[PDB]
Amino acid sequence: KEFRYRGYTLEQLMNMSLEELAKLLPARQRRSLKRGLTPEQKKLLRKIRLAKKGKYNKPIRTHCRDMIVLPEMVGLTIYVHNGKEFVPVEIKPEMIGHYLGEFAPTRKRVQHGAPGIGATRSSM
Amino acid sequence: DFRHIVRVAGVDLDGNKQLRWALTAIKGVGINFATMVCRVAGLDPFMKAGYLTDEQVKKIEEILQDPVAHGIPRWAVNRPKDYETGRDLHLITAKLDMAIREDIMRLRRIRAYRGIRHELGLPVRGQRTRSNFRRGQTVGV
RNA sequence: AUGCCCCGAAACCCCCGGGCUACACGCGCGCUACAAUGGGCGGGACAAUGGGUGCCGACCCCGAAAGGGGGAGGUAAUCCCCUAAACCCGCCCUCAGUUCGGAUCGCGGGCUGCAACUCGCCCGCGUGAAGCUGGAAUCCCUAGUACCCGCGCGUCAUCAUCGCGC
RNA sequence: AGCGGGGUGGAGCAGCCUGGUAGCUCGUCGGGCUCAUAACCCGAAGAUCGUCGGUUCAAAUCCGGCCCCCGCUACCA
Numbered sequence: 001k002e003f004r005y006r007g008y009t010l011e012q013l014m015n016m017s018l019e020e021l022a023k024l025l026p027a028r029q030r031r032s033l034k035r036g037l038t039p040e041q042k043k044l045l046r047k048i049r050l051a052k053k054g055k056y057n058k059p060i061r062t063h064c065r066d067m068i069v070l071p072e073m074v075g076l077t078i079y080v081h082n083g084k085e086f087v088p089v090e091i092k093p094e095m096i097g098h099y100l101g102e103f104a105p106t107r108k109r110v111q112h113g114a115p116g117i118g119a120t121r122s123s124m
Numbered sequence: 125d126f127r128h129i130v131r132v133a134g135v136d137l138d139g140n141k142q143l144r145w146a147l148t149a150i151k152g153v154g155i156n157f158a159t160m161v162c163r164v165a166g167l168d169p170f171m172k173a174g175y176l177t178d179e180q181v182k183k184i185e186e187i188l189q190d191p192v193a194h195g196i197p198r199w200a201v202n203r204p205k206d207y208e209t210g211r212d213l214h215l216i217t218a219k220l221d222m223a224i225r226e227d228i229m230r231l232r233r234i235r236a237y238r239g240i241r242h243e244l245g246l247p248v249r250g251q252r253t254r255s256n257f258r259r260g261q262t263v264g265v
Numbered sequence: 266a267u268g269c270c271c272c273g274a275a276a277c278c279c280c281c282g283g284g285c286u287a288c289a290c291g292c293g294c295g296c297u298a299c300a301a302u303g304g305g306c307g308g309g310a311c312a313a314u315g316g317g318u319g320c321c322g323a324c325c326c327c328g329a330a331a332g333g334g335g336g337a338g339g340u341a342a343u344c345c346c347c348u349a350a351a352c353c354c355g356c357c358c359u360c361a362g363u364u365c366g367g368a369u370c371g372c373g374g375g376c377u378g379c380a381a382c383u384c385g386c387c388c389g390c391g392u393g394a395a396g397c398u399g400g401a402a403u404c405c406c407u408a409g410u411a412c413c414c415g416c417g418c419g420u421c422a423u424c425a426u427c428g429c430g431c
Numbered sequence: 432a433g434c435g436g437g438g439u440g441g442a443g444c445a446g447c448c449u450g451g452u453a454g455c456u457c458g459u460c461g462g463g464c465u466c467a468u469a470a471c472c473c474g475a476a477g478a479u480c481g482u483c484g485g486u487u488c489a490a491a492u493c494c495g496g497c498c499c500c501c502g503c504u505a506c507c508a
């Protein structure tokens with residue numbers, strides 16, 4: 001009842017080159033990794049590695065909704081912009097291979113009211 | 125000789141149909157995959173299902189257990205590259221149902237967008253919802 | 266284009282992320298169907314308009330497919346897009362929610378792009394919803410016209426159930 | 432207090448007597464017609480019969496006990 005991703009434990013995923021890991025992800029993630037990371041993602045990754053090393057005792061806030069979750073990011077809490085505020089996300093092992101934006105909804109759930117004037121033919 | 129009901133892999137099969145179409149009653153087997161397994165087993169896909177003998181049924185079930193090891197291509201199975209083991213699997217009946225349920229449950233545990241959409245019973249693959257997808261009752265003004 | 270009134274360190278000018286794609290519900294215009302005046306599998310036939318150098322790409326090789334690697338010729342009555350579909354012949358299915366219908370969803374593989382989650386398009390296996398011809402009402406059309414069938418251009422990095430034409 | 436009568440969609444009435452589909456008119460919601468409203472047309476929702484029991488192959492219908500409503504009469508601190 002441990003975690004496995006394609007028959008690998010978490011540690012085996014930790015000690016992998018970015019290329020070796022890219023062969024396990026779905027096609028969209030593989031193409032995104034092969035084409036390189038954008039500069040903003042580079043800065044975010046630098047901050048993440050610093051925080052893991054034992055420095056940067058501050059919360060991580062980022063505008064990068066298109067960043068792919070990587071195994072070395074597991075255990076940290078990231079604040080992802082949803083359009084008007086930063087929401088906390090706690091990265092769990094079963095999130096590997098997803099974009100960050102999937103965990104920060106940008107619209108509010110709809111609870112309908114009573115239909116107003118002009119909602120039907122007879123109300124006009 | 126002729127049997128009007130033949131039991132294969134826990135599903136009764138109509139004995140009057142051609143074997144390729146009789147096989148589709150199994151959940152997880154469509155018309156294309158059925159023809160593939162008929163060809164691999166070396167049986168005429170146009171024969172009546174009622175003329176199957178016991179050894180032939182045993183062989184068909186053996187093939188359905190692990191198609192890849194019997195020569196069926198990896199790009200033909202309904203769950204390639206399994207999320208847990210990493211292998212190429214083909215699931216039928218209950219196993220298929222519980223695998224799909226587990227996939228949706230995993231999506232729901234991490235509070236992903238698609239998991240929320242599954243919970244609320246709303247379209248998941250990006251459809252517009254202002255006009256179509258209406259299932260309910262007209263409200264009064 | 267332009268008078269008057271307003272803002273004139275914000276109502277002007279840039280950058281990042283969201284939205285215009287929300288969803289108990291009412292309506293317009295369409296597409297796909299409810300099967301035999303058919304569905305599937307193999308085989309055989311015959312176009313026109315337009316467009317191409319930030320582009321059209323034959324021909325060879327690799328891959329099951331979507332696609333990938335090289336690349337002649339073309340600034341074009343010369344080279345390319347470009348060997349249409351409805352139609353015809355043979356076999357399977359025989360009136361059934363089905364070998365009718367293909368919505369919805371799972372897993373995997375690709376392309377464009379600085380970026381594909383919100384929110385793109387394509388391919389393989391699986392899954393298999395409503396629908397069995399439609400009340401009161403109401404639209405279009407007089408001849409190569411209406412019905413039926415595909416194709417080109419515009420938009421366009423990618424994307425056509427649309428517009429204008431054939 | 433005594434006697435007589437009756438309870439059925441939101442409203443007012445059939446369906447009893449002769450047991451075996453719960454109908455009629457208005458009303459609400461939606462679509463039609465008209466430049467728009469009313470009138471008119473179409474479709475759908477809505478009571479399982481005041482409750483409880485007995486009878487019967489089967490009860491709104493036959494019977495009985497309760498709850499409520501209406502009418503008539505006796506009734507002088």
Ligand SMILES: [Mg+2]
Pocket residue numbers: 285
């Ligand atoms: Mg809009």
Ligand SMILES: [Mg+2]
Pocket residue numbers: none
């Ligand atoms: Mg079909």
Ligand SMILES: [Mg+2]
Pocket residue numbers: 250
């Ligand atoms: Mg998406």
Ligand SMILES: [Mg+2]
Pocket residue numbers: 397
């Ligand atoms: Mg029918």
Ligand SMILES: [Mg+2]
Pocket residue numbers: 427
């Ligand atoms: Mg348009």
Ligand SMILES: [Mg+2]
Pocket residue numbers: none
């Ligand atoms: Mg009116």
